[PDB]
C-alpha cells in the first residue's frame with residue numbers, strides 16, 4: 141500500500157488572435173520542461189471578449205497587446221514586439237524604401253477590422269496619419285490580411301513574432317521597416333487584483349518575458 | 353497619345369478559419385501567376401456568418417468544408433482533406449496505436465466549439481461515438497487547440513492541409529491515423545445561383561482542386 145500525500149495544476153489563459161498562434165507555441169514548450177505539472181487550458185478571442193471573460197472569472201489570466209482598456213485589472217508588461225511592413229516581391233519595385241506613406245497609392249494599406257487591437261497599435265506606433273492610404277476593405281484575420289498583400293494588393297503592418305514563426309513562408313513577401321523609432325507593441329499579462337494566484341502569474345510573466 | 357480600350361478584376365472570397373490559413377496561401381501564389389489580373393479580397397469567418405454574407409451579396413464566393421447547411425446555394429466539391437489525430441511526443445507512450453477511443457482516458461479528446469464545422473466533420477468521419485472521451489473545455493481556435501495537445505493534455509483531430517502548412521512545427525507532436533476509412537472532409541466552393549460569374553467560379557474551382 142502507500143501513504144497518501146504554485147506552478148501546479150490547471151490555468152485558464154486567454155490570448156488575442158495576433159499573439160496566440162505565435163508566442164503560445166514557445167510558451168507551451170518552455171512550461172512543458174520547466175513546469176511540467178502546469179496544464180494550460182487556452183482561449184483565443186479578441187481583447188474585449190477576453191476582458192469580459194477575465195472579469196467574470198471564466199479565465200485566470202490573459203496575454204494581451206497593450207495598451208488597451210483594462211480598468212481595474214492588474215497588469216505587467218513583459219516585452220516588446222516590433223512591427224514591420226510587408227509587400228509582395230512582385231510589387232516591391234513599385235514602392236520605394238524607406239517608406240513614406242505620402243508616396244504610397246491611396247487605399248494601399250490594408251488593416252484588420254477595429255475589434256483587433258493590432259490596427260490601433262500599428263497605426264499609432266508607425267505614425268500612419270493619412271487615412272486616405274487605408275483601403276476601405278477591412279481584413280478579418282492576420283492570415284488573410286497577409287494573403288491579400290501576397291496577392292499584390294497593397295501593404296500592411298505585421299508583428300515580429302508572426303514573422304519569426306513563419307507566417308510569411310512561401311508567400312514571396314519582402315519585409316520593410318516602418319516609419320518611426322517606436323514601431324512596436326507592448327505585450328503584457330493581465331489578471332484580477334483579488335486573485336490568490338499572483339505568485340503563479342508573476343512566474344509566468346517571467347517565462348513570457350524570456351520569449352520576447 | 354493612345355487609343356482607349358472572366359478571371360479579371362476583383363473577387364470577394366470568404367473562407368473558414370480551419371481552411372483559410374493553409375489553402376489560401378497556395379491559391380494566392382497560383383493565381384498570381386496564372387490569373388495576374390484577379391484581385392482576391394478575403395474574408396475569414398465561420399460557416400454561418402459566411403453564408404449570411406454570401407446570401408446578402410457581401411461576398412461573391414466561399415471556400416467551405418462540406419457538408420454544411422447551404423440551402424439554395426450552388427456548390428461544387430473540389431477535393432478531400434484527410435483527418436489525422438495528434439498527440440504530444442511525451443504522451444505518445446501513454447496512448448497505443450492503432451487508436452481505439454474506448455482505450456483513451458475520459459475527457460482526453462479536445463474539440464473546437466460547435467460554431468466550427470471541423471468538430472462535426474471530424475467526429476462523424478472518424479466515428480467518435482463515445483461522448484465521455486470529449487473534454488468539456490472547448491477550444492476556440494485551431495492553433496490553441498494544437499497548443500493544448502502539445503502541452504500534453506490530450507488528443508484531437510487535425511486537417512491534413514494544416515499539417516502540410518507547418519502547423520505542428522516545433523511543437524513535438526506525433527501524427528496518427530484516426531479510426532475509419534472515410535476520415536476526411538470535403539472541400540467545396542459555394543456561390544449564388546443568380547450570379548453572372550459562374551465561369552469565373554468554375555475556373556477557380558479547377559485551380560483549388562489542383563491544390564488538394
Ligand SMILES: [Cl-]
Nearest residue numbers: 186187256257
Ligand atoms: Cl484583439
Ligand SMILES: [Cl-]
Nearest residue numbers: 398399468469
Ligand atoms: Cl466554420
